[PDB]
Design a protein around this motif. Structure first.
Motif, PDB file in Angstrom:
ATOM      1  N   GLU C 523       0.874  -1.190   0.000  1.00  0.00           N
ATOM      2  CA  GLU C 523       0.000   0.000   0.000  1.00  0.00           C
ATOM      3  C   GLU C 523       0.929   1.264   0.000  1.00  0.00           C
ATOM      4  OE1 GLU C 523      -2.769  -2.975   1.407  1.00  0.00           O
ATOM      5  OE2 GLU C 523      -1.797  -2.451  -0.501  1.00  0.00           O
ATOM      6  N   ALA C 561       3.443   1.730   6.446  1.00  0.00           N
ATOM      7  CA  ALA C 561       2.615   2.932   6.096  1.00  0.00           C
ATOM      8  C   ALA C 561       1.336   2.969   7.049  1.00  0.00           C
ATOM      9  CB  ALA C 561       2.176   2.893   4.595  1.00  0.00           C
ATOM     10  N   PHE C 797      -5.314  -8.118   8.518  1.00  0.00           N
ATOM     11  CA  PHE C 797      -5.215  -6.678   8.900  1.00  0.00           C
ATOM     12  C   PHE C 797      -6.550  -6.193   9.603  1.00  0.00           C
ATOM     13  CE2 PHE C 797      -5.054  -1.993   8.273  1.00  0.00           C
ATOM     14  CZ  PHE C 797      -3.795  -1.761   8.877  1.00  0.00           C
TER      15      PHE C 797
HETATM   16  C1  LIG Z   1      -5.163 -12.266   3.293  1.00  0.00           C
HETATM   17  O1  LIG Z   1      -3.779 -12.027   3.664  1.00  0.00           O
HETATM   18  C2  LIG Z   1      -3.686 -10.649   4.139  1.00  0.00           C
HETATM   19  C3  LIG Z   1      -3.467 -10.589   5.698  1.00  0.00           C
HETATM   20  O2  LIG Z   1      -2.219 -11.266   6.021  1.00  0.00           O
HETATM   21  C4  LIG Z   1      -3.406  -9.074   6.088  1.00  0.00           C
HETATM   22  O3  LIG Z   1      -4.683  -8.441   5.789  1.00  0.00           O
HETATM   23  C5  LIG Z   1      -2.276  -8.355   5.240  1.00  0.00           C
HETATM   24  O4  LIG Z   1      -2.254  -6.935   5.623  1.00  0.00           O
HETATM   25  C6  LIG Z   1      -1.205  -6.235   4.875  1.00  0.00           C
HETATM   26  C7  LIG Z   1      -1.181  -4.677   5.234  1.00  0.00           C
HETATM   27  C8  LIG Z   1      -2.642  -4.148   4.866  1.00  0.00           C
HETATM   28  C9  LIG Z   1      -2.869  -2.635   5.165  1.00  0.00           C
HETATM   29  C10 LIG Z   1      -4.209  -1.928   4.773  1.00  0.00           C
HETATM   30  C11 LIG Z   1      -5.088  -2.823   3.844  1.00  0.00           C
HETATM   31  C12 LIG Z   1      -3.740  -0.412   4.612  1.00  0.00           C
HETATM   32  C13 LIG Z   1      -2.175  -0.342   4.937  1.00  0.00           C
HETATM   33  C14 LIG Z   1      -1.692  -1.787   4.537  1.00  0.00           C
HETATM   34  C15 LIG Z   1      -0.258  -2.316   5.132  1.00  0.00           C
HETATM   35  C16 LIG Z   1       0.860  -1.228   4.903  1.00  0.00           C
HETATM   36  O5  LIG Z   1       1.087  -0.360   5.741  1.00  0.00           O
HETATM   37  C17 LIG Z   1      -0.376  -2.709   6.692  1.00  0.00           C
HETATM   38  C18 LIG Z   1      -0.625  -4.295   6.656  1.00  0.00           C
HETATM   39  C19 LIG Z   1       0.869  -4.911   6.600  1.00  0.00           C
HETATM   40  C20 LIG Z   1       1.320  -4.611   5.083  1.00  0.00           C
HETATM   41  C21 LIG Z   1       2.781  -3.952   5.089  1.00  0.00           C
HETATM   42  C22 LIG Z   1       3.822  -4.925   5.742  1.00  0.00           C
HETATM   43  C23 LIG Z   1       3.285  -3.635   3.662  1.00  0.00           C
HETATM   44  C24 LIG Z   1      -0.007  -3.823   4.468  1.00  0.00           C
HETATM   45  C25 LIG Z   1      -0.033  -3.786   2.880  1.00  0.00           C
HETATM   46  O6  LIG Z   1      -0.835  -4.621   2.167  1.00  0.00           O
HETATM   47  O7  LIG Z   1       0.661  -2.984   2.264  1.00  0.00           O
HETATM   48  O8  LIG Z   1      -2.465  -8.454   3.957  1.00  0.00           O
HETATM   49  C26 LIG Z   1      -2.503  -9.847   3.454  1.00  0.00           C
HETATM   50  C27 LIG Z   1      -2.694  -9.859   1.914  1.00  0.00           C
END
Ligand SMILES: CO[C@H]1[C@@H](O)[C@H](O)[C@H](OC[C@@]23C[C@@H]4[C@H](C)CC[C@H]4[C@@]4(C=O)C[C@@H]2C[C@H](C(C)C)[C@@]34C(=O)O)O[C@@H]1C
Ligand SMILES: Nc1nc2c(ncn2[C@@H]2O[C@H](COP(=O)(O)OP(=O)(O)O)[C@@H](O)[C@H]2O)c(=O)[nH]1
Ligand SMILES: [Mg+2]
Lengths: 52, 94, 841, 89
Positions: C523, C561, C797
């Motif tokens: 993201e 982020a 998340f």
């Molecule tokens: C189904 O699998 C899922 C779960 O494990 C979880 O929802 C995971 O979350 C990832 C993150 C999701 C966040 C939101 C949707 C907004 C901000 C995003 C993040 C970046 O800061 C925080 C968590 C951790 C990742 C950071 C490290 C880049 C995120 C990303 O996808 O970029 O995503 C995977 C695909």
RNA sequence: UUCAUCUAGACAGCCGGACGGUGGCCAUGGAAGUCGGAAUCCGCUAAGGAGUGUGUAACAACUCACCGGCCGAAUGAACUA
């Protein structure tokens, strides 16, 4: 591999001590005075840090 | 009843559950007390109490584990107050 | 035995003559070495060749490194007598038997191949140890196949190192393997289903074995119970019954008595270590000290063959020769497998239901249940089986009820396809039906109900895992399980930007070669990878560098982020102007509670809905004034986020024409943020005053851009500079014998525990916990090391809670992160204040 | 009378027990492993499938042994503050 | 050098229990004597402190405490040189 109460008497030797805070020396569970003089006799003893 | 530090004994006969509670010091301080001493208090701390009640906590002591083995109302003449920072009743407790 | 396709499909035609199962374990407990001795004994092979030794033909470059990642069900040829099959509660017949046994690597943090091998078989081969018994990790894989419904078969392996590298005593070795039983009486009693009732395995009925891989020896209770049942005048089932518990024969009173006490009080040693382990103990000191005082002469007292090159050797290598001869590899192993570990036909009597889910008494469901091998083809590739032919990918599946052929145009559907669609429903013609064999695959033509084999050319459109249906009314099976859930994160982006197209191709190819893996985008703007375990991830990453992608890839700690929010109301109405000093936009920034701000991004309040009916939703139940909702212009960022623009003005007669000018500049501003450089959250702009000068030559476009810019720039700084940090959601399932070890992880790694609960009376608890995004970079290791691999973190998340520190404050959490975030861009190293962004005369 | 019991102070009478069901859910049996007794499960409920002669009547009692005997409601200090001397009118 | 407890009965020390109200006021995802802070009481006897620490996730349990048998009768608190 050591039995609970049989492993309890094994602690009465290498666990139930008191480590000197400047010598480290291995001393008694209720002892409050050092036996060596690399410190000239002291009382700074914390019952030896056992397991968690 | 009581929703904070209240002892609850669940005695069941293989699917036939019967309800019996020890009525803790917590249960009784709310037992006779009015609304500001029963509901609406979670974000606001309960440390309010002074007003006299009399022999009515004598019967309420019959619900707080009678394992004290002595004289009911004479023992609470200490319990409710020093441990019960909610209610002071007759100033003879402390 | 050297077979041909007809001899294969011959025992395949026989449904009740197939052993569909894998191998449940507790890590390196002789599983890979156990299967190597089985091909050397009588493992079905091709139409030529002869390869027997140990490892090599089961693992490849995994041979030079050291691990087992290829879990295939190599079918073998068994030679079970008609007398053994005399009490087998199956409809099986014959002498030539089949063994559809999968390898399956036991340990945790890799329960991916583990839960996928359970989704293609009726039972499994559990491997516990003498030097470990029934521990934490076997507890894991055992309770795992019980909340899946499978038939349990025990083999206390390495009793060889329990009498060579150590050496135990007779009756004391009784409670050693009797304690491994009391530990199995613990896993069964809680995690076993009422559908199977009495299923606690007891080697008192020949359920638990005795073996060692380098010894080539495989022992089963039933082995000497039958080779001695007749030599005692006792029943076969009552001879093995008086061999566990109250079993003391007296070579003096010569009777199988209950109590070991006599008319004095003197004891009686076990007849199990008196007729089964007594002379067995003699075999120990037999080759260990070379006591020819028994050795060959004792060989006849046991009924063994002494052949030339046998006594031609010496030492321990000599004891391995008589161990593989006293209790032969394929013989005793295939023995209990063809005994109490059934064929799909007789065991699916309970398995069939939990397999195909969604519809109560479905049409194809009753077919899979009673099993019809020519009915509507019900197949499920639990996890594709790609090889090493420049990207030659295959599919690993269970053919429940139905036949599959070479060139069949079946409906290759996906977990996204549900009856009323066509999505992932790629009804394509299969090029050829594959027949896997341990580690390699060759060309076959067809297979029926209750078999395990593959398909080819399906890879081109099927992603992750896929169900193969020829019937349209077909829903799908249960979408696997995974009580493991990936908890690893990495900034796995290009190390050489010229080949970025190769990374996204292989990111899917990782999903292609993995049971559960998240190969999404960041993201922030990088390529994020999420694995099961650290060990696990690491491996698939070097594989991403050699073939999957093939070129330099730089992995970095998971680049984060968060959101840019406000704490209290804006201090004063922020006045703004143009680089002209003409147009003057005055506004403020107000707080949006979770339920209404989260409701903006949810869709309850969306721009792609009329502002009249959307204003009703807000006004009527939520509590959001009607005129304030019919005045909301843009939803930053882009056009649907929780950073609104509510106009609360009355003057400026030219506001109506450049309405989208304020709106579009704001979408550009909340996108490329003020405090550091990312997007905001829960901040809605309240524009109060404005000024429109001369013609539109000064009213719009870029003249209006640095205006609405410094507008909310100054306003965010006035509405109170704070930040909402990204909260993660992890529900760790771990035994009560380790509840406070995870609690230690909480009182340390921010214990925002949603709540602690589970099921009063069961082992593992349901630990709901709120954990920051970064407070989870390595969380996997600490959890399992805090209280053994008993911890099982469920990742995903969650929401955004209150962050204590302040963005514009260089040493506090927030500020230090922000200052480090601007060096992440490769430019400015400071936090510019609203003082240098406010407007005056 | 009344007086239940204490642990690891005296080993007075021989430790004997019968073989029926206790009815407890599966849990403290990981120590019944490392110790060594003939146990099994009666459709979930923890059932002792043998009358065990645990420890002797005249030795040093302890932590491991008091855990399993306190779950049986056994009380060896079967006594009660009673009399010594006697005086009446 | 000042200050205690006792010889028809003290100490260090050997041995036995360790009360309840109470899972105390709150605070609680979770603190039932032992994360935290404020209340730091008597019913009753020989006695048991809202409790000395360990250890619990919290309980539980061990155990300092207070109290009885054994203690020779003294040496403990505390500093000075
Ligand atoms: C189904 O699998 C899922 C779960 O494990 C979880 O929802 C995971 O979350 C990832 C993150 C999701 C966040 C939101 C949707 C907004 C901000 C995003 C993040 C970046 O800061 C925080 C968590 C951790 C990742 C950071 C490290 C880049 C995120 C990303 O996808 O970029 O995503 C995977 C695909
Ligand atoms: N002597 C002996 N060695 C063993 C035994 N089991 C495993 N090993 C050793 O462990 C090595 C690899 O074992 P591995 O195939 O990883 O066991 P697995 O993980 O259960 O399949 C072999 O090369 C052996 O040297 C055994 O029972 N006896
Ligand atoms: Mg291996």
């Amino acid at each position: 591999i050591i039995e609970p109460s049989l492993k309890a008497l094994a602690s009465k030797y290498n666990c139930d001590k008191s480590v000197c805070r400047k010598c480290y020396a291995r001393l008694p569970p209720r002892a409050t005075n050092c036996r060596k003089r690399k410190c000239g006799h002291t009382n700074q003893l914390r019952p030896k840090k056992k397991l968690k | 009843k009581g929703i904070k530090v209240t002892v609850q004994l669940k005695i069941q006969n293989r699917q036939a559950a019967a309800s019996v509670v020890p009525s803790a010091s917590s249960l009784v301080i709310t037992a006779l007390k009015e609304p500001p001493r029963d509901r609406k208090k979670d974000k606001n701390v309960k440390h309010s109490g002074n007003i006299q009640l009399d022999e009515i906590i004598e019967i309420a002591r019959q619900m707080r584990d009678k394992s004290f083995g002595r004289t009911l109302a004479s023992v609470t003449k200490e319990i409710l107050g020093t441990a019960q920072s909610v209610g002071c009743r007759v100033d003879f407790k402390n | 035995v050297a077979f041909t396709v007809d001899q294969m499909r011959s025992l395949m035609d026989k449904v009740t003559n197939v052993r569909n199962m894998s191998v449940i374990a507790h890590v390196d407990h002789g599983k890979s070495t156990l299967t190597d001795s089985l091909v050397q004994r009588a493992g079905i092979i091709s139409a030529a060749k002869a390869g027997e030794a140990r490892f090599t033909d089961t693992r490849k470059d995994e041979q030079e490194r050291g691990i087992t990642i290829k879990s295939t069900a190599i079918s073998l040829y068994s030679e079970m007598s008609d007398e053994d099959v005399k009490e087998i509660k199956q409809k099986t017949d014959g002498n030539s038997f089949l063994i559809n046994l999968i390898d399956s690597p036991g340990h945790v943090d890799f329960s991916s191949e583990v839960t996928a091998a359970l989704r293609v078989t009726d039972g499994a081969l559990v491997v516990v140890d003498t030097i470990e018994g029934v521990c934490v990790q076997t507890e894991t894989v055992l309770r795992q196949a019980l909340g899946e419904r499978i038939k349990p078969v025990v083999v206390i392996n390495k009793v060889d190192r329990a009498l060579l590298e150590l050496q135990v005593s007779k009756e004391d070795l009784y409670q050693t393997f009797a304690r491994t039983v009391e530990s199995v009486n613990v896993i069964v009693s809680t995690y076993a289903d009422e559908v199977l009732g009495d299923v606690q395995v007891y080697p008192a009925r020949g359920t638990v074995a005795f073996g060692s891989g380098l010894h080539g020896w495989a022992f089963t209770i039933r082995q000497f119970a039958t080779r001695y049942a007749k030599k005692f005048g006792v029943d076969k089932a009552k001879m093995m019954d008086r061999l566990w518990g109250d079993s003391f024969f007296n070579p003096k009173t010569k009777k199988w008595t209950n109590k070991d006490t006599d008319a004095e009080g003197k004891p009686l040693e076990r007849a199990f270590n008196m007729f089964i382990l007594d002379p067995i103990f003699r075999l120990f000191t037999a080759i260990m000290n070379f006591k020819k005082d028994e050795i060959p002469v004792l060989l006849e007292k046991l009924e063994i063959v002494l052949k030339g090159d046998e006594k031609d050797l010496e030492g321990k290598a000599l004891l391995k020769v008589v161990m593989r001869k006293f209790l032969p590899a394929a013989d005793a192993l295939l023995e209990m497998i063809v005994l109490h570990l059934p064929s799909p036909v007789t065991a699916q009597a309970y398995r069939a239901e939990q397999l195909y889910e969604g519809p109560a008494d479905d049409a194809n469901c009753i077919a899979i249940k009673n099993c019809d091998p020519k009915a509507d083809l019900m197949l499920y590739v639990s996890k594709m089986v790609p090889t090493s032919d420049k990207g030659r990918f295959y599919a690993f599946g269970r053919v429940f009820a139905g036949t599959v052929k070479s060139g069949q145009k079946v409906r290759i559907q996906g977990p996204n396809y549900v009856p009323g669609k066509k999505d992932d429903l790629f009804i394509k013609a299969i090029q050829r039906v594959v027949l896997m064999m341990g580690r390699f695959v060759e060309p076959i033509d067809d297979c029926p109900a209750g078999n395990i084999i593959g398909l080819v050319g399906i890879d081109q459109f099927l992603l992750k895992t896929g169900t193969l249906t020829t019937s349209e009314t077909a829903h799908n099976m249960k979408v696997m399980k995974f009580s493991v859930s990936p908890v690893v994160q990495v900034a796995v982006e290009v190390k050489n930007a010229n080949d970025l197209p190769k990374l996204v191709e292989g990111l899917k190819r990782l999903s292609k070669s993995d049971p559960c893996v998240l190969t999404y985008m960041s993201e922030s703007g990088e390529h994020i990878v999420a694995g099961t375990g650290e060990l696990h991830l690491e491996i698939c990453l070097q594989d991403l560098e050699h073939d999957h992608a093939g070129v330099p890839l730089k992995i970095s700690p998971p680049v984060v982020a968060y959101r840019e929010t406000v704490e209290s109301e804006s201090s004063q109405t922020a006045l703004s102007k143009s680089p002209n000093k003409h147009n003057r936009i005055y506004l403020k920034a107000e707080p949006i509670d979770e339920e209404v701000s989260l409701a903006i991004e949810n869709g309850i309040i969306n721009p792609r809905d009329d502002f009249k009916a959307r204003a009703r939703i807000m006004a009527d139940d939520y509590g959001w004034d009607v005129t304030d909702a019919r005045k909301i212009w843009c939803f930053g960022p882009d056009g649907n986020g929780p950073n609104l623009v509510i106009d609360q003005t009355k003057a400026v007669q030219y506001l109506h024409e450049i309405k989208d000018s304020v709106v579009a500049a704001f979408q550009w501003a909340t996108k490329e943020g003020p405090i550091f450089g990312e997007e905001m959250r829960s901040v809605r702009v309240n524009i109060l005053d404005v000024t429109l000068h001369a013609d539109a030559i000064h009213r719009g476009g870029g003249q209006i851009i640095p205006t609405m810019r410094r507008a909310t720039y100054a306003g965010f700084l006035l509405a109170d500079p704070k930040i909402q940090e990204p909260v993660f959601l992890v529900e760790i399932q771990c035994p009560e014998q380790a509840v406070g070890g995870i609690y230690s992880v909480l009182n340390k790694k921010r214990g925002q525990v949603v709540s602690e609960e589970q099921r009063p009376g069961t082992p593992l608890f349901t630990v709901k916990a709120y954990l920051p995004v970064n407070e989870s970079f390595g969380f996997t290791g600490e959890l399992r090391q805090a209280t053994g691999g008993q911890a099982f973190p469920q990742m995903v998340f969650d929401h955004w809670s209150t962050l204590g520190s302040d963005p514009l404050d260089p040493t506090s959490k927030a500020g230090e992160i922000v200052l480090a975030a601007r060096k992440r861009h490769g430019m400015k190293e400071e936090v510019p204040g609203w003082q240098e962004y406010y407007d005056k005369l | 009378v009344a007086a239940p019991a204490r642990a690891g102070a005296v080993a007075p009478e021989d430790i004997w027990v019968r073989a029926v069901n206790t009815g407890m859910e599966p849990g403290k049996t990981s120590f019944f492993q490392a110790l060594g007794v003939p146990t099994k499960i009666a459709r979930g409920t923890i059932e002792i499938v043998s009358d065990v002669k645990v420890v002797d009547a005249g030795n040093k009692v302890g932590q491991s042994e008091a855990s399993l005997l306190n779950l049986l409601n056994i009380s060896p200090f079967t006594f009660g503050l009673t009399v010594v001397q006697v005086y009446d009118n």
